[PDB]
Design a protein that fits this description.
This is part of a larger assembly, with chains A (about 210 residues), B (about 55 residues), C (about 100 residues) and D (about 100 residues). In chain A, strand 1 (about 30-40) and strand 2 form a beta hairpin. Helices cover about 35% and strands about 25% of the residues of chain A. A four-stranded antiparallel beta sheet of chain A has the order 5-4-7-6. A three-stranded mixed beta sheet of chain A has the order 1-2-3. In chain A, helix 4 runs antiparallel to helix 5 (about 115-125). The N and C termini of chain A lie far apart (about 65 Å). Chain A is globular, with a radius of gyration of 20 Å. Chain A contains six helices and seven strands. Chain A has helices at about 5-25, 55, 60-75, 95-110, 115-125, 160-165, and strands spanning about 30-40, 45-50, 80-90, 130-135, 145-155, 165-175, 180-185. Helix content of chain D is about 25%, strand content about 45%. Chain D has two helices and five strands; from the N terminus they run βαβββαβ. The chains are: A alpha+beta (about 210), B alpha+beta (about 55), C alpha+beta (about 100), D alpha+beta (about 100). The interface of A and C includes residues 18, 65 and 73 of A. The structure holds potassium ion (K) (3 copies), magnesium ion (13 copies) and sodium ion. One magnesium ion binds next to loops of chain B. Chain A binds one RNA strand of 451 nucleotides through helix 1, helix 6, strand 6 and strand 7. Chain B: One of its GO terms (cellular component) is cytosolic small ribosomal subunit. Chain B: Belongs to the universal ribosomal protein uS14 family. Chain B: InterPro entries: Ribosomal_uS14, RIbosomal_uS14_euk_arc, Ribosomal_uS14_sf. Chain B: Keywords: Metal-binding, Ribonucleoprotein, Ribosomal protein, Zinc.
RNA sequence: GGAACUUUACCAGAUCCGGACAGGAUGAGGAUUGACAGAUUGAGUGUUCUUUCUCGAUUCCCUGAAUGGUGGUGCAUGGCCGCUUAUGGUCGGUGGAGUGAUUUGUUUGGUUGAUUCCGUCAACGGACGAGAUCCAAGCUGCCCAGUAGAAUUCAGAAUUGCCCAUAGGAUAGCGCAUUCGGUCGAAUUCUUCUCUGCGGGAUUCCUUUGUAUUUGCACAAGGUGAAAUUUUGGGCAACAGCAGGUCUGUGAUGCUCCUCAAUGUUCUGGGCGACACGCGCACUACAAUGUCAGUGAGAACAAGAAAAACGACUCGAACCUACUUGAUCAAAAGAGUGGGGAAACCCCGGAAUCACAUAGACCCACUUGGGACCGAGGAUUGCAAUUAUUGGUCGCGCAACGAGGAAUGUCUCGUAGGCGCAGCUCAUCAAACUGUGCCGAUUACGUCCCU
């Protein structure tokens, strides 16, 4: 043998990291937004978050069963011991992973960088985010590489609280000239529900309750 | 006998040549603590998913 | 190892590939790949599985995905038709990923 | 008299405390004898590595830490009753192990 | 990036195709694969020949294009990191001012580490950065312990009073005397110590026959207190950039180079370690605030074993360690018997700096300082130890070095310095790094002379 708790935690983390990488590469064009797994004695239940759940499932769940076969064979799960579920993200514009994939798709379609980046920002700010900051870099215009950033609204950079209020994701775009990096940051609106927003007040914001 | 010679030393399974990153299969600067077997550069990218955090 | 794939080993891999529409194999030349075919386990070297799947991919019969030293080959509709003719199965035969 | 030990282990402090409290409340509902819960020492997995991918620049380091929280609850209850107490939905990342003390 | 092989990218050779696929030849009257023996050979390597067997349609033969590459180009790139830059910096909107580039905002004054605040004001409103947030450490509450302990009862066992040493000082005690973690005793009672999830606690809070004071923002001493100023130490850290580094992390990547006697891949052997020399960092010293020999008391972070495989039939073994033997005679070994998945075994974690009224040896000398170089024996890790792998033993010590010119590094409190220990690299090897604890100061708490 029984592995120690340290070894068990390391093993579980490595399993999640490999599962995340496999789904990130497999579901790149379906707006993959995250993955969580719940382990019981009966089965291991894996829930995939995506924007286009129809493409993640496929006809009669052909795609989702193919992904189940991949995970089951790689990790040697037995029959009936592994299950996959697909749920949609409530707000796509508040997911950095979904938006950075959308930006990469738009760039791969020969769209201008200014157009695609501003399109992402307008969509994100319409979704209720406090702020969005997307940046595109590398061989944008010609042989010399330059980096250009587009931002709107609020954004916190320092401290440890931005790990909770800021959603980030970076992707590589493979163009004819070379590799283009796209990074999208979303300032999540603090919402009392934990699905979209840390639900905590901002670390430096002080509110005085109005008297009765 | 070229099948017996082929990768005969790699079958011994000792030293840095027998070990590689579980992500990138590189045989240099391998983190073997807690049986991670992950390259140092690959660990910095995947540390958040594995569960490690930067605190102090 | 040797890339030369015995014909019975190819038939076993293809039968497994059709039964479970996905094959996952670690990319290590001196490694062994294990699969289950209607009970029991048959072993093929990982390099030979890689060779068979590389041939299929060059003919656009499968889709290949790679992550963390592992391949993930999935039969395509053309690949399903190819395996159904190769394995001499009935037209009603389908991989488990397509059964209701 | 059978004594059964429940070990709750996770790397999330909030999850392990929530599971422990739920187990404790359910165990008190079946009015069984409780010993604990005991907050065992929390272990910090520590990995320090260079920040640069190359070898250039000031030798700066990143200290990554993983904390493991473990709790033990001893129950004087039959295996059927301890299964009933355990029978609920737990948070993800929390490992609960059941063992019968010698 | 502590390279024996591998790693490895270099050198001398020798294999394999890991050239998919397509098109065209041959082709079950056989496309092809693999080999015993004897030669070739570094090879008891079918790599090639002689010789035939073997496998069967997977290949092979030719053209194209693919593939792989620690090949180039970091001056084509992504990502990451470093640096400018540890300081207090940065940017719109609308408004004002200029033909404009631009400017105001963003400020003369005081204050703060702070573009931190208070005032002032052609601005007003905001956004970052600073602060706040976060993680540890110090004090503390609740909760908690068959993985931490304590106290008290009985029961067992031990010392027990006259004693003053080879010369024997100084240092508490003067209703019930102490001690025994194997006494591998048995029961009650508890959380003081330990463990810890969420809390509490500190903020210029209180004072001043202080400073400064229209005010304000504040400062200095002293209280309170575990802690008295960003509590302490870290992490994070804007906007602009640099042709800084990385194509030797990746199935990151454009172009280009090689591609079947290959720059792919594997195997054998060398090299990365070579030494008239120069330079940067570290270790050990030059001794008596010492070296030996003995004895005592005594930490904290931490690490520990395996599979879709091997044997039994889910379990065992790998990893760490304790105890015992080896031992009717060196170390290092070698062996058993247990334990530990790690608050459970190691472990009451007997670290050494340190201490010793040890009545110990040495006595100022390159000397019992120093331990570099080198010689013989033996053991261990490994498939392989020669170019000593690494310990252990006896020798060498006559190798310099007796405190180091000009120059130069780091540092303000549990800090410098000194001392070890663990992790990490790791089959074996630490003078490295990342942490940890132990003994613990001098000096200043200032300035803009130098940078
Ligand atoms: K004007
Ligand atoms: K600047
Ligand atoms: K010696
Ligand atoms: Mg801020
Ligand atoms: Mg800060
Ligand atoms: Mg070699
Ligand atoms: Mg490469
Ligand atoms: Mg550069
Ligand atoms: Mg760059
Ligand atoms: Mg200005
Ligand atoms: Mg000042
Ligand atoms: Mg000022
Ligand atoms: Mg590496
Ligand atoms: Mg070198
Ligand atoms: Mg000496
Ligand atoms: Mg080093
Ligand atoms: Na390149």
């Amino acid at each position: 043998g029984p592995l120690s708790k340290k070894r068990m935690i390391i093993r579980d983390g490595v399993f999640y990291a490999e599962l995340f990488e496999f789904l990130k590469r497999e579901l790149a064009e379906e707006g993959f937004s995250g993955v969580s797994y719940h382990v019981t004695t009966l089965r291991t239940e894996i829930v995939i978050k995506a924007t286009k759940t129809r493409e993640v499932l496929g006809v009669n769940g052909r795609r989702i069963r193919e992904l189940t076969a991949c995970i089951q064979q790689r990790f040697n799960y037995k029959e009936g011991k592994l299950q996959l579920y697909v749920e949609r993200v409530e707000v796509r514009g508040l997911s950095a992973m979904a938006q950075v994939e959308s930006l990469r798709f738009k760039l791969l379609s020969n769209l201008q960088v200014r157009r695609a980046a501003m399109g992402i920002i307008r969509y994100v700010m319409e979704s209720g985010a406090k702020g969005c900051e997307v940046t595109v870099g590398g061989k944008i215009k010609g042989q010399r590489a330059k980096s250009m950033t587009f931002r709107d609204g609020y954004m916190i950079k320092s401290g440890t609280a931005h790990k909770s209020f800021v959603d980030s994701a970076c992707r590589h775009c493979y163009m004819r000239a070379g590799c283009i990096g796209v990074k999208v940051k979303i300032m999540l609106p603090g919402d009392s529900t934990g699905r979209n927003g840390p639900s905590e007040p901002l670390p430096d914001v002080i509110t005085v309750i109005e008297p009765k | 006998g070229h099948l017996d010679q082929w990768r005969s030393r790699q079958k011994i399974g000792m030293g840095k040549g027998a070990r590689c990153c579980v992500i990138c299969s590189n045989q240099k600067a391998l983190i073997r603590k807690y049986e991670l077997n992950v390259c140092r550069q690959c660990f910095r990218e995947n540390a958040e998913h594995i569960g490690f955090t930067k605190l102090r | 190892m040797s890339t030369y794939v015995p014909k019975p080993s190819r038939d076993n891999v293809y039968r497994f590939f059709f039964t479970e529409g996905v094959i996952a194999c670690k990319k290590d030349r001196m490694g062994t790949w294990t699969g289950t075919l209607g009970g029991n386990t048959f072993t093929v070297p990982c390099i030979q599985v890689m060779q068979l799947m590389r041939s299929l991919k060059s003919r656009n019969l499968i889709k290949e995905q790679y992550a963390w030293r592992h391949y993930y080959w999935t039969l395509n509709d053309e690949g399903i038709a190819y395996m159904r003719s190769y394995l001499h199965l009935a037209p009603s035969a389908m991989p488990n990923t397509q059964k209701p | 008299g059978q004594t059964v030990r429940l070990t709750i282990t996770s790397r999330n402090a909030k999850a392990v405390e929530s599971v422990t409290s739920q187990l404790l409340t359910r165990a008190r509902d079946e009015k069984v004898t409780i010993h604990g819960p005991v907050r065992l020492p929390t272990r910090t997995l520590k990995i320090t590595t260079r920040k640069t991918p190359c070898g250039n620049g000031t030798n700066t380091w990143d200290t990554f830490e993983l904390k493991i929280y473990k709790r033990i609850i001893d129950l004087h209850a039959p295996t059927e009753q301890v299964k009933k107490i355990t029978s609920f939905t737990m948070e993800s990342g929390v490992d609960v192990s059941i063992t019968i003390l010698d």
